[PDB]
Amino acid sequence: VDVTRDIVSRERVWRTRTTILQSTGKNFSKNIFAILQSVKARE
Amino acid sequence: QSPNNIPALLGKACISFNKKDYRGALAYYKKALRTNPGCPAEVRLGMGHCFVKLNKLEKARLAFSRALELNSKCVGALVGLAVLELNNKEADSIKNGVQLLSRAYTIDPSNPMVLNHLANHFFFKKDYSKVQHLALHAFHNTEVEAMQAESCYQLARSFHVQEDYDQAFQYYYQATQFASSSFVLPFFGLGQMYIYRGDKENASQCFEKVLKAYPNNYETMKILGSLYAASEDQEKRDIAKGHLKKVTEQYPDDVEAWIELAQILEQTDIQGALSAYGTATRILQEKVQADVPPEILNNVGALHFRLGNLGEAKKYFLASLDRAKAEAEHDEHYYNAISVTTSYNLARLYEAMCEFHEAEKLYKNILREHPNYVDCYLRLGAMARDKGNFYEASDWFKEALQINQDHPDAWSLIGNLHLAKQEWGPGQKKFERILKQPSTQSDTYSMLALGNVWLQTLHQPTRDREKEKRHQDRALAIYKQVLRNDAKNLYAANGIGAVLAHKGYFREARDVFAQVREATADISDVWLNLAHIYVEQKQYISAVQMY
Amino acid sequence: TYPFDQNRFVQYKATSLEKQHKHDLLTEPDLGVTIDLINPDTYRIDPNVLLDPADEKLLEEEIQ
């Protein structure tokens, strides 16, 4: 109905699900994938 | 061959002038007035125009003056002094308008300079008729780009205040396209014209050159109101921050400046948004004692919801609903819908009070009047989930999919219910496949849920049977997938460290958990998983404290 | 969000940014003079030469 688009337009979402999982700092995964490959070097 | 007369070398100096070398111009131009050949064309005119360059104005005035004494009929001296006194408009208005301009119009009514200047004067004198009489001729009679750029620009500002914006848009574009490096008002005209007709994508691009020109208070608000910065888009958001702290210290009758301050601050620090709303509450009271619109007050209560200021957040929602009631006739603005979402926020607040009774009341008030809404339909379900799973919790959740099967949040919450039934472990492939339709994909939350239901399979005596080894490597594959699509997820890295710790690499685990440890300490899982490593080195005196 | 007016129009106006601009004189690209060695049929170099006080203070580049 008009109420649905009427509300979901005017509000805002600053807090979702997905960026909870993502960290507020910058933690890249190269270090993570480097040790991922390093344990594979033990394999 | 023959340096026996000066206009042989003065033609060098006009070339030098047009190469922007006014020094090389005036070097030969000194040789003009020492000799002064037969020149009714006033070598002193170009003298003054070089003195117009690089602000040698007092020499320019004297050159145009002696040009007028040799011949008052000549146009260039009078228009030169006309532009020279275009600096002061509130001071010496009349002599600019009539003596400096209308006399040039008299001695030549076809001079596109004086036509352009009477045009912009008539604009400021609010004579919007004869500006369009003579700006067309000011366009046709000139043939150089910047002049006809200014002609199109002035016809554009004429039809802009006359709201003939379709034609004036074309004039603005032609004004930009003729001579662009001259000056930036045609760029501003196009950018604000892109607010017409929804053309605002080019407004940002065109207004960027205004900041490339030079920053001003003006050129903040255009990019601030024209906020393509929605979220995680710093190319419009960092510049928004810069303009907002370009205007916050200022006050060109700042009213909404704090509103679009805090409007990006809700992603950022909340206290900045609080402060913006604080003086924004005030700023609506002094020009007229006007009550704050309830959208502001609801949002500041929403801020205090994630703060400790829960009680006055409730007071904000109450007075928000009252001000929406004070919006008695505003179904255009739909104060009723604003009250709907305000009541949603207040019921969420009553949940924070653990006043689930009144939360039920507000929720059923909204759903009995807007049953199409889903979030109220499931927060009720979440409330009964706090009581338990097979309640009408689970059924509100399933009917939330019945009203909206496209809804990924509720659909995730369906399997979230099934997390309680871990015996429904391998069955969760199906109930977390339903919206693995690629419209919903990518869903990091759900695929990490797949990883988690896949890891709870572990610590079984079947690893030696290669079954949990395959499960470990399958969870590893999920974690590699979420690794590549997101380096900065932390629950992922927790999962990698957990599965490799189940692989017996505990020296290889405290490091990867250390990363998410500085990333955020406020993950309950990593506290446990680190101390498991500690007791695996028998480091109890490092472990139980963190327990 | 706030229901902002679409600011498709100027009333402040930009006139602070407008009259600060000093406007070029490019009526004739060789700077408003016909460049000719034939139309000087006359010459002040003959007795007597003429040079106004304004003309000497324009014969200097920058001496103030």
Curated annotation (Swiss-Prot), chain A:
Region (Interaction with CTNNB1) location: 1-33
Tissue: Found in adrenal and parathyroid glands, kidney and heart.
Post-translational modification (record): Phosphorylated. Dephosphorylated by PTPN11.
Entry's localization field: Nucleus
Protein family (similarity comment): Belongs to the CDC73 family.
Purpose: Tumor suppressor probably involved in transcriptional and post-transcriptional control pathways. May be involved in cell cycle progression through the regulation of cyclin D1/PRAD1 expression. Component of the PAF1 complex (PAF1C) which has multiple functions during transcription by RNA polymerase II and is implicated in regulation of development and maintenance of embryonic stem cell pluripotency.
Oligomer status and interactors: Component of the PAF1 complex, which consists of CDC73, PAF1, LEO1, CTR9, RTF1 and SKIC8. The PAF1 complex interacts with PHF5A. Within the PAF1 complex interacts directly with PHF5A. Interacts with POLR2A, CPSF1, CPSF4, CSTF2, KMT2A/MLL1 and CTNNB1. Interacts with a Set1-like complex that has histone methyltransferase activity and methylates histone H3. Found in a complex with BCL9L or BCL9, CDC73, CTNNB1 and PYGO1 indicative for the participation in a nuclear Wnt signaling complex. Interacts with PTPN11. Interacts with SETD5. (Microbial infection) The PAF1 complex interacts with Zika virus French Polynesia 10087PF/2013 non-structural protein 5/NS5. The interaction with viral NS5 proteins may reduce the antiviral immune response by inhibiting the recruitment of the PAF1 complex to interferon-stimulated genes, thus preventing their transcription.
Disease linked to the protein: Hyperparathyroidism 1: An autosomal dominant disorder characterized by hypercalcemia, elevated parathyroid hormone (PTH) levels, and uniglandular or multiglandular parathyroid hyperplasia, adenomas, and carcinomas.
Listed name of the protein: Parafibromin
Organism listed in the record: Homo sapiens
Gene expressing this chain: CDC73
Residues of the full protein shown: 218 to 260 of 531
Curated annotation (Swiss-Prot), chain B:
Domain of life: Eukaryota
Subunit structure: Component of the PAF1 complex, which consists of CDC73, PAF1, LEO1, CTR9, RTF1 and SKIC8. The PAF1 complex interacts with PHF5A. Interacts with KMT2A/MLL1. Interacts with STAT3. Interacts with SETD5. Interacts with ERCC6.
Spans of repeat TPR: 6-39, 41-74, 78-111, 149-182, 184-217, 255-287, 294-327, 340-373, 374-407, 409-441, 456-489, 490-523, 524-547
Provenance organism: Homo sapiens
Described function: Component of the PAF1 complex (PAF1C) which has multiple functions during transcription by RNA polymerase II and is implicated in regulation of development and maintenance of embryonic stem cell pluripotency. PAF1C associates with RNA polymerase II through interaction with POLR2A CTD non-phosphorylated and 'Ser-2'- and 'Ser-5'-phosphorylated forms and is involved in transcriptional elongation, acting both independently and synergistically with TCEA1 and in cooperation with the DSIF complex and HTATSF1. PAF1C is required for transcription of Hox and Wnt target genes.
Tissue: Widely expressed.
Localization annotation: Nucleus speckle
Protein name as annotated: RNA polymerase-associated protein CTR9 homolog
Disulphide linkage map: none
Curated annotation (Swiss-Prot), chain C:
Cysteine-cysteine disulfides: none
Location(s) in or outside the cell: Nucleus
Membrane-crossing segments per the record: none
Biological role: Component of the PAF1 complex (PAF1C) which has multiple functions during transcription by RNA polymerase II and is implicated in regulation of development and maintenance of embryonic stem cell pluripotency. PAF1C associates with RNA polymerase II through interaction with POLR2A CTD non-phosphorylated and 'Ser-2'- and 'Ser-5'-phosphorylated forms and is involved in transcriptional elongation, acting both independently and synergistically with TCEA1 and in cooperation with the DSIF complex and HTATSF1. PAF1C is required for transcription of Hox and Wnt target genes.
Family to which the UniProt record says this protein belongs: Belongs to the PAF1 family.
Oligomer status and interactors: Component of the PAF1 complex, which consists of CDC73, PAF1, LEO1, CTR9, RTF1 and SKIC8. The PAF1 complex interacts with PHF5A. Interacts with POLR2A, TCEA1, SKIC3, KMT2A/MLL1, SUPT5H, RNF20 and RNF40. Interacts with UBE2E1. Interacts with PINT87aa which is encoded by the circular form of the long non-coding RNA LINC-PINT; the interaction enhances the binding of the PAF1 complex to target gene promoters and may anchor the complex on target gene promoters, sequentially pausing RNA polymerase II-induced mRNA elongation.
Annotated protein name in UniProt: RNA polymerase II-associated factor 1 homolog
Organism: Homo sapiens (Human)
Species classification: Eukaryota, Metazoa, Chordata, Craniata, Vertebrata
Parent sequence residues shown: 50 to 113 of 531
